[PDB]
Amino acid sequence: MKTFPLQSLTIIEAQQKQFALVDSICRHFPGSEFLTGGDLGLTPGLNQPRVTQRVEQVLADAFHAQAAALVQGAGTGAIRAGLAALLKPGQRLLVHDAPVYPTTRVIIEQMGLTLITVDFNDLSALKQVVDEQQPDAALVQHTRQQPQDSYVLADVLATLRAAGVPALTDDNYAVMKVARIGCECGANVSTFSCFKLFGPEGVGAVVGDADVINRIRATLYSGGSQIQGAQALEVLRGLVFAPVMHAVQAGVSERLLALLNGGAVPEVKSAVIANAQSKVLIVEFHQPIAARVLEEAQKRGALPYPVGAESKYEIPPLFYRLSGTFRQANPQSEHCAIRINPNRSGEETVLRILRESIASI
Ligand code: NI
Numbered sequence: 320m321k322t323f324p325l326q327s328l329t330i331i332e333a334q335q336k337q338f339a340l341v342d343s344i345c346r347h348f349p350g351s352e353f354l355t356g357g358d359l360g361l362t363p364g365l366n367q368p369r370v371t372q373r374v375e376q377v378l379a380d381a382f383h384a385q386a387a388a389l390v391q392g393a394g395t396g397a398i399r400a401g402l403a404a405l406l407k408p409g410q411r412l413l414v415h416d417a418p419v420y421p422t423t424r425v426i427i428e429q430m431g432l433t434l435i436t437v438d439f440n441d442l443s444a445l446k447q448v449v450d451e452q453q454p455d456a457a458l459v460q461h462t463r464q465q466p467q468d469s470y471v472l473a474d475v476l477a478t479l480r481a482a483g484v485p486a487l488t489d490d491n492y493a494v495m496k497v498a499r500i501g502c503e504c505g506a507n508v509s510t511f512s513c514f515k516l517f518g519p520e521g522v523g524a525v526v527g528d529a530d531v532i533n534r535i536r537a538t539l540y541s542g543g544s545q546i547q548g549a550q551a552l553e554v555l556r557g558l559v560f561a562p563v564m565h566a567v568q569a570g571v572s573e574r575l576l577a578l579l580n581g582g583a584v585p586e587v588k589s590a591v592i593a594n595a596q597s598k599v600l601i602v603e604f605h606q607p608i609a610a611r612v613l614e615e616a617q618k619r620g621a622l623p624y625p626v627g628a629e630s631k632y633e634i635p636p637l638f639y640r641l642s643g644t645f646r647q648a649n650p651q652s653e654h655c656a657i658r659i660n661p662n663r664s665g666e667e668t669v670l671r672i673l674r675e676s677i678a679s680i
Pocket residue numbers: 604605606607608654655
């Protein structure tokens with residue numbers, strides 16, 4: 320099948336992103352202050368830890384934005400906070416003609432928003448619908464929601480900005496893996512889970528325009544609302560490791576794809592790289608052995624279900640079922656095909672686990 324995956328960073332490009340983030344750290348933390356472990360609580364004038372503020376400044380700087388806020392609830396929390404700062408309950412939100420991310424749909428339902436739908440793959444239709452229906456804001460997913468999605472993030476954002484429609488991007492599984500996240504190419508705010516970036520459980524980030532971020536910070540009254548200094552430092556730690564380790568993974572996925580396409584595993588009928596929704600391999604077998612292969616692969620070290628995904632815990636490759644939306648659209652595929660996210664493994668390991676599992680069914 321045909322896909323249009325996001326463009327991965329090379330190892331050289333990834334190093335440059337790593338270095339640029341560390342440069343921002345240096346410019347916001349005197350060295351002795353970086354070794355302070357992270358402060359706690361509702362410090363006067365900030366209503367958050369001093370170190371958390373600093374980390375937020377670093378995040379804003381690193382992603383070419385005015386401001387940032389760390390929030391509870393990871394990626395879902397970030398999207399909720401961002402949407403709540405862009406529109407009111409009962410207002411109109413523009414979304415792409417494809418399945419809305421499940422917890423995002425929950426947020427939409429809990430806010431009583433009216434959805435306006437258009438195919439983002441058709442910029443002409445996008446522009447017409449925006450002019451006619453006058454949405455109060457737009458949400459754009461960075462990763463691919465369905466195989467046929469081929470739109471360029473920056474171009475969709477540019478269209479929205481020209482029409483004066485505030486835009487939020489859901490950048491999960493794209494951050495530190497592509498050249499520009501939403502707030503770097505036209506969005507009013509980007510959002511992402513830090514848990515999916517080798518960071519701490521429960522922590523999400525909203526990064527973008529100060530007026531939006533300030534509205535978010537104003538709602539974070541309570542002690543529990545805050546991200547503690549140590550958690551904030553862990554976000555930076557994870558983010559510094561993210562680009563290079565993912566560039567290594569992107570290389571593994573490309574080499575694995577080439578080997579499979581070259582016939583390394585005769586029992587494989589087809590293989591493709593796809594954003595599903597993170598960039599992974601989709602491997603289809605000639606015979607309906609997918610479930611058996613998944614069972615055998617787990618015994619040989621493959622992760623059988625995700626955590627983050629792409630969290631600090633997820634080191635061995637993930638061999639997993641197909642996504643819900645894809646299975647709905649293609650009811651027979653689940654018997655024949657699987658997703659593989661190599662995580663920190665190499666292609667020879669994935670190939671070996673694949674071959675040994677097939678031999679053992
Ligand atoms: Ni089959």
